[PDB]
């Protein structure tokens, strides 16, 4: 009977809560009192890369630091050379509603998906020069909406129909599905040691995934509505997340709760990109009102503005080596700052 | 090394660009329509599906969605640069649901500039179902309403003329409120039987494309 | 978390009177749009009333017009609808929504099924 087994889920929770609260000694921010400001920063645009035809819905950075792509609802994926302003390929495709892309760590591949509920991979350091599509992955439902490369050979995709897949491209087929998730999953990303990665879902839930085992460990919640953007501390052991109620917060993964929370009464918009810096001191986010702020981690209090676009901002991304920031909207430009 | 690289930088950055100009001469030249709602009837006429038909020597193209989820809330926001928005309402409950969803469609922050076609199909079955022995019950403002004097009938009953017209302002309140001038609304009455749809559609992007212009000079 | 226990139903004669209410806990009452929906034995899901931030705008489906009142009460984060005139059409359980976004005009995706934001239901018969 139905009765006895919510009842049953109603006394696990409450032994949750009471575990949670019996560990919330104190906050971050009577630790972090004492810690002097970070105080104003000022970054100017440095470059302007202009060309394509259409809104911009996803990019990415490389390994190397230099070489970036970007993807168009036009119906096109380019590769820039940031450093002066060159593109160096251009790759047409079959459908063109394009929503997310990916870079290998070695570079030598590339991946784009879309309501096309596919997954291509396409190769770049071919013997013949042209760029060709390696292979088409399939079998999701949904539309997809972000991809990452684990190696050469897995890649792991989350779609619209509340499930996460690993894929083993040589032999194009899955190794292991996630389930759990009750709403579409937006974004994901993964640990830096690659063995744990976190996914956002449009439940304002967010849950810790094992790659190996294939199960879910924890499951965080405190948000308000969907969230969109996701990103992992430097250390491992924190993450943050972006939502629709003009708020972000930062959750912990060895105590099971949120730490801190960024808001402000003039912001009502919401958020669509979260992203770190090396140290892990400021934390980027891009807003519905054309702007990007930067907040303090550790002291919830903002620092900079960065405007210059248009239109809504899409797409955020931080170089390895931490050296520059490229913010990509939907008025078909992207800039790179410093 | 180092200006052989550039130089080659250079050839490979100038042969990509007029490719890409000569792929920008094509796109900006197609117009894009999306199809939600009997629609596969006026497409007669995987994740998506498309279909290309030109007329007056003027490309078009339809995109339908389907093997998606119910929940659309989030994957509607691709179609914010499409010329139109055609939609498809069976008009004869479903109703309250198309009448619901259009108001959503409307007032969407994303969707404020973007234009919608409106057919109301299956007239026929109307037709039969007034005088064939009731929808004072679903919606009670109809005892209080007449066919309007700038109505346009047919030839071959004065009570199918009437709940056309009711359907039609009834999807028209919405329209007419909370509305800018950014985008407006094109209702059509059209049947399975009907073989003049695209002509109805050339006409009504002509439309939408000089109110735009109009709109854009400061004289409408 | 988001949480939405719902209380009222029952039992009543045709030409009854019943009041249901819901209570909201883990989010700002005074920001979001609210909704009824309900669901008849062997039928999909129905869209009933609607209510604004602040109450000045009310809408009602067209056979439930005159019949039902809705209400909202921000101090105390909770919403009513009170039921009168019953007839036996309306045997359903009845579900509380709320709006995807705050500050937002527009509803999305209420009436389909796998919603989030929707509660367990009350059980009306008639």
């Known amino acids: 009977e139905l009765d006895q087994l919510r009842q049953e889920a109603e006394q696990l929770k409450n032994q949750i809560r009471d575990a949670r609260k019996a560990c919330a000694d104190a906050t971050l921010s009577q630790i972090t009192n004492n810690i002097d400001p970070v105080g104003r920063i000022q970054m100017r645009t440095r470059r302007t890369l202009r060309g394509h035809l259409a809104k911009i819905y996803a990019m990415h950075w490389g390994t190397d630091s230099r070489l970036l792509v970007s993807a168009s609802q036009d119906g096109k994926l380019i590769i820039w050379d940031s450093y002066t302003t060159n593109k160096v390929h251009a790759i047409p495709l079959r459908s063109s509603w394009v929503m997310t892309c990916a870079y290998a760590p070695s570079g030598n591949y590339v991946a784009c998906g879309g309501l096309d509920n596919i997954c291509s991979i396409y190769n770049l350091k071919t013997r013949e020069g042209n760029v060709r599509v390696s292979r088409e992955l399939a079998g999701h439902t949904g539309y997809l909406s972000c991809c990452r490369f684990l190696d050469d050979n897995q890649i792991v995709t989350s779609s619209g129909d509340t499930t996460c897949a690993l894929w083993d491209i040589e032999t194009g087929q899955q190794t292991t599905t996630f389930t759990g998730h009750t709403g579409d999953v937006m974004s994901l990303s993964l640990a830096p040691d690659t063995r744990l990665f976190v996914s956002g879902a449009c439940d304002a839930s967010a849950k810790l995934w094992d790659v190996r085992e294939g199960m879910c460990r924890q499951t965080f919640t405190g948000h308000e509505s969907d969230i969109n953007a996701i990103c992992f501390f430097p250390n491992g052991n924190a993450f943050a997340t972006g939502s629709d109620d003009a708020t972000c917060r930062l959750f912990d993964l060895r105590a099971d709760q949120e730490l801190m929370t960024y808001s402000h009464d003039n912001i009502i918009c919401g958020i669509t990109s979260v992203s770190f810096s090396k140290s892990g001191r400021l934390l980027l986010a891009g807003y519905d009102d054309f702007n990007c702020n930067v907040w303090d981690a550790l002291k919830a209090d903002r620092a900079g503005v960065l405007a210059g676009h248009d239109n809504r901002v899409s797409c955020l991304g931080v170089t390895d080596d931490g050296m520059a920031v490229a913010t990509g909207s939907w008025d078909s430009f992207l800039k790179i700052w410093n | 090394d180092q200006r052989n690289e550039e130089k080659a930088q250079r050839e490979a950055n100038k042969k990509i660009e007029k490719q890409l100009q000569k792929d920008k001469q094509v796109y900006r030249a197609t117009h894009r329509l999306l199809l939600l709602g009997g629609k596969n009837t006026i497409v007669k006429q995987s994740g998506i599906f498309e279909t290309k038909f030109q007329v007056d020597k003027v490309n078009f193209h339809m995109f339908d969605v389907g093997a998606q989820r119910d929940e659309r809330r989030k994957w509607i926001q691709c179609f914010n640069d499409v010329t139109a928005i055609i939609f498809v309402v069976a008009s004869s409950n479903r109703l309250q649901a198309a009448l619901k969803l259009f108001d959503s469609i409307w007032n969407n922050k994303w969707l404020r500039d973007t234009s919608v076609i409106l057919f109301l199909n299956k007239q026929d079955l109307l037709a039969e179902k007034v005088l064939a022995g009731k929808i004072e019950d679903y919606f009670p403002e109809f005892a209080r309403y007449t066919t309007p004097e700038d109505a346009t009938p047919e030839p071959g009953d004065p009570r199918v003329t009437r709940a056309k017209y009711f359907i039609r302002d009834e999807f028209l309140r919405i329209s007419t409120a909370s509305g800018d001038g950014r985008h407006y609304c094109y209702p059509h009455f059209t049947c399975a039987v009907d073989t003049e749809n695209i002509r109805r559609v050339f006409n009504d992007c002509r439309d939408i494309i000089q109110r735009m212009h109009l709109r854009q000079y400061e004289l409408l | 978390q988001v949480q939405l226990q719902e209380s009222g139903g029952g039992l009543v004669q045709p030409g009854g009177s019943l009041r249901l209410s819901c209570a909201a806990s883990?989010?700002?009452?005074?920001?979001?749009?609210m909704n009824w929906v309900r669901q008849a034995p062997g039928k999909g899901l129905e869209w009933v009333s609607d209510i604004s931030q602040s109450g000045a705008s009310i809408s009602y489906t067209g056979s439930v017009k005159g019949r039902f009142t809705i209400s909202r009460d921000n101090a105390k984060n909770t919403l009513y609808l009170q039921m009168n005139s019953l007839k036996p059409e309306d045997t359903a359980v009845y579900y509380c929504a709320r709006c995807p976004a705050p500050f937002t005009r527009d509803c999305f995706d209420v009436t389909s099924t796998t919603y989030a934001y929707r509660g367990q239901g009350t059980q009306v018969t008639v």
């Open positions: 883990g989010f700002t009452f005074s920001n979001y749009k």
